[PDB]
Amino acid sequence: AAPGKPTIAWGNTKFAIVEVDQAATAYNNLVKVKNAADVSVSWNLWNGDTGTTAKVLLNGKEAWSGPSTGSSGTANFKVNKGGRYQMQVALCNADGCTASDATEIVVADTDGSHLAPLKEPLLEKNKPYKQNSGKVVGSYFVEWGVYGRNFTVDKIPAQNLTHLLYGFIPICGGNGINDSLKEIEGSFQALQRSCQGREDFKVSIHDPFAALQKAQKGVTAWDDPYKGNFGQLMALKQAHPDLKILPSIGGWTLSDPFFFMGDKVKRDRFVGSVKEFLQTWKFFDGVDIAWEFPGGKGANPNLGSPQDGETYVLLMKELRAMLDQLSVETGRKYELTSAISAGKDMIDKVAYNVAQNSMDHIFLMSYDFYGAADLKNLGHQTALNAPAWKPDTAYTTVNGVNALLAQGVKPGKIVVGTAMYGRGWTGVNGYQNNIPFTGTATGPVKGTWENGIVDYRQIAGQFMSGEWQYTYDATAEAPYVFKPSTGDLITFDDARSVQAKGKYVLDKQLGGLFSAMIDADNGDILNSMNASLGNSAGVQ
Ligand SMILES: CC(=O)N[C@@H]1[C@@H](O)[C@H](O[C@@H]2O[C@H](CO)[C@@H](O)[C@H](O)[C@H]2NC(C)=O)[C@@H](CO)O[C@@H]1O
Ligand SMILES: *[C@@H]1O[C@H](CO)[C@@H](O)[C@H](O)[C@H]1NC(C)=O
């Protein structure tokens, strides 16, 4: 007679191709990429003959076979593809095979193949749009936004984006390499701990707790291998397979290492570490380079060289070559993008007409044109055009676009930036003709989280009532609010100025719109980005 029916032993059923060490702070130890997950199953036979061969089946296909030598057994084998499998133990003899009932096993991998889709309702004022314009609709999400801001990946209105950028991936390095981080309490030390035993100029993760270990919706079970932002982003990819999720390397305080990459030894090490990062974290779709900025004038006053423009072009070409190779190895398309200064002087330090051939999208940082760092020269921080009271204003969106086009950049490469926050001043005084910008300030406006910066959610929620004036400057295409009793003046984007940018993008055949930072919107800004680019209302 055929063997008795085996009973699968109670035991762990959750396995991982990329293993996470739960007691490690160094990135080198935190993540272990394997070629396959090590899976184990045991069984007992309570009734009948134990057979002569035991097999482990996954969805009916043998993953392991061995002699059946007694009433209990154990099998260890490898599984090289993530997902969920119906696992059975079968006992066989010459008279037949008898299979256990199925037990589901989970084999995790960093594409999120083991995760249920993270498909969350739109929150606040966000309304559904279809991504059918063919234009970029992008936004950055910041790693540390999950703390005080409480803005997690399940709050991203992901169906309303084509591109979600993750800020920010650091480049390893201590003294002289990441000195800009020392201005943020604890942050330089946090990077040194993440990078312990890891070569300078390789990428890492700045905050492994936020990125991988903090419990979040959909990744709360203790043995879920990937939690935090990365686990949720994997689940988000399962819900939105066409969303491009890009890691952004750099930003204001993590850009110092780029200034050393004129040394090809370092640049090669960096590019290779980016490839390894994308092979490790399969849910990412390419790389965004947020080097602030070639030539200097970013966070570090001691960095910047006339060589930086050449280094930037070489870096883009080598990144593209690495991504093209990764693409044909995987069958996937990978994107290379960069966030760049929108000032003409800064733009002209780089030959973007050359670099554009390596890049899918240029994220033009057409914001922060004015702010509390200068209390004497006030202006619109993210306007399309110059205002009527100063038509020679240098820092406008159009002037940045025009600087790129004049180099020879194709317009379809250029993604115009919108702000989901305001910048502002206090004590504005001595202005003429009811235009507060013609005055001078005494300090920064009180911020939501940081001095001189106010989330758009708070502008709409608190500063559009009471004593606050509201004015839309139709020449500049820029709104502003002003409280005369205290001289508080805030410059920001609203639905109308975003609409003007979207129409400008369509008219000039630009690439689309993007914002920083997604957590600060109440929905008004992203809704307008979508509508103004011609995306249809509804769900896809
Ligand atoms: C588009 C651009 O280059 N904007 C600059 C701002 O980024 C600078 O403010 C800095 O912003 C970063 C985040 O991007 C903060 O981490 C940093 O603390 C902040 N620094 C200061 C001094 O506010 C700004 C500084 O003058 O310069 C541009 O606006
Ligand atoms: C900007 O400064 C804030 C305040 O210290 C910090 O939280 C954040 O990491 C900085 N942003 C970037 C992109 O460096």
Q: Which of 306, 285, 283, 269 has its CA nearest to residue 226?
A: 283
Task: Give one DSSP letter per residue of 76-128, joined into a string.
Answer: EEEE-S-EEEEEEEEEEETTEEEEPPPEEEEEE-TT-TTS----PPP-TT---
The set of protein residues with a Cβ atom below 6 angstroms from ligand 2 is 144, 168, 184, 251-253, 450
Obtained via which technique?
X-ray
Closest atom of ligand 2 to 253 CA is 14
Cis previous bond, 517, omega within 30: yes
> Ligand 2 centroid to 181 CA: how many Å?
9
Q: Whose CA is nearest to atom 20 of ligand 1?
A: 299
Give me the count of residues in the chain.
Answer: 540
- Structure tokens that stand for 340 in this block: 């760049």
- What are residue 402's DSSP bridge partners? none
Distance 252 CA to ligand 1 centre (A): 7
From the CA of 250, the nearest ligand is 2
Sequence-ordered list of residues with C-beta below 8 angstroms from that of 147, at least 6 positions apart, any chain: 210
**Contacts for 491 with CB less than 8 Å, ≥ 6 apart:** 370, 379, 380, 381, 382, 422, 423, 424, 478, 480
Residue 495 is given by DSSP the state: H
CB-defined site of ligand 1, < 6 Å? 252-253, 292, 341, 365, 368, 371, 373
Instruction: Establish how many alpha carbons lie within 13 A of residue 200's alpha carbon, considering only the half-sphere containing its beta carbon.
Output: 14
Is the N-terminal amide bond of 258 cis, ω within 30° of 0? no
- 44: domain CATH number is 2.60.40.10
Whether the link from the prior residue into 293 is cis, omega within 30° of 0, is yes
Ligand 2 centroid to Cα of residue 534, in Å, is 33
Which tokens hold the place of 72?
A: 């209990």
CB 411 within 8 A of CB 477: no
- The C-alpha atoms of residue 207 and residue 229 are separated, in whole angstroms, by 10
Atom of ligand 2 lying closest to residue 168 CA: 13
> Range of 78's domain?
7-108
Which residue has 């059946």 as its token pair? Answer: 68
> How many CB atoms are located within 10 Å of the residue 15 CB?
23
What are the strands, taking DSSP E only, across 160-201?
A: 163-169
Give the separation between CA 497 and CA 200, rounded to whole angstroms.
43
Q: What is the DSSP letter of 501?
A: H
Instruction: Tabulate helix, strand, coil % of the chain (nearest 5).
Output: 30, 25, 45
The contacts of residue 195 (CB under 8 Å, 6+ apart) are 26, 27, 170, 172, 173, 174, 202, 204
Q: State the DSSP code for 65.
A: E
Q: Return the residues preceding each gap in the chain, C–N over 2.5 A, or none.
A: none
Our answer to whether residue 104 is catalytic in this structure is no
From the list 143, 292, 318, 477, the catalytic residue is: 292
- Amino acid (1-letter code) at residue 411: P
